[PDB]
Amino acid sequence: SGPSCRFCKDDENKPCRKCACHVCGGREAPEKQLLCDECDMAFHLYCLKPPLTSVPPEPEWYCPSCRTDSSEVVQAGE
Ligand SMILES: [Zn+2]
Ligand SMILES: [Zn+2]
Ligand SMILES: [Zn+2]
């Protein structure tokens, strides 16, 4: 019925990359997790660049990669 993530095998406790903080490949230190609305992806304070010592006062949270001008190159030659 819901978003049944095949990577999790439905179970949250299994090491599934696409629901973890990919920057260190883990879900640990939940206190320091910062989720990115548009990336659908968990991060950590100590996994940011510049690494924040504390949570920002911004309710909506975008990672540095969201304002990075060096975007991924959409591969041509279809
Ligand atoms: Zn998952
Ligand atoms: Zn992390
Ligand atoms: Zn982001």
Side-chain angles (χ1 to χ4, degrees):
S1 51
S4 305
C5 175
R6 309 301 171 209
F7 307 93
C8 285
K9 302 183 177 303
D10 184 76
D11 184 80
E12 59 173 271
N13 297 88
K14 300 183 183 304
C16 162
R17 178 176 297 243
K18 295 188 176 183
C19 304
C21 163
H22 300 54
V23 191
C24 62
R27 300 168 294 125
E28 315 190 71
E31 57 173 346
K32 290 169 173 58
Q33 289 187 270
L34 288 176
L35 287 67
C36 208
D37 299 278
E38 76 315 300
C39 289
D40 291 274
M41 191 169 301
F43 293 78
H44 289 128
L45 291 176
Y46 56 94
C47 298
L48 302 182
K49 189 57 179 61
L52 298 177
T53 188
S54 179
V55 59
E58 306 174 282
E60 56 189 279
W61 191 84
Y62 306 87
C63 63
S65 182
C66 270
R67 64 186 302 193
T68 299
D69 299 281
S70 303
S71 307
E72 189 183 281
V73 181
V74 184
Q75 297 174 89
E78 184 185 80

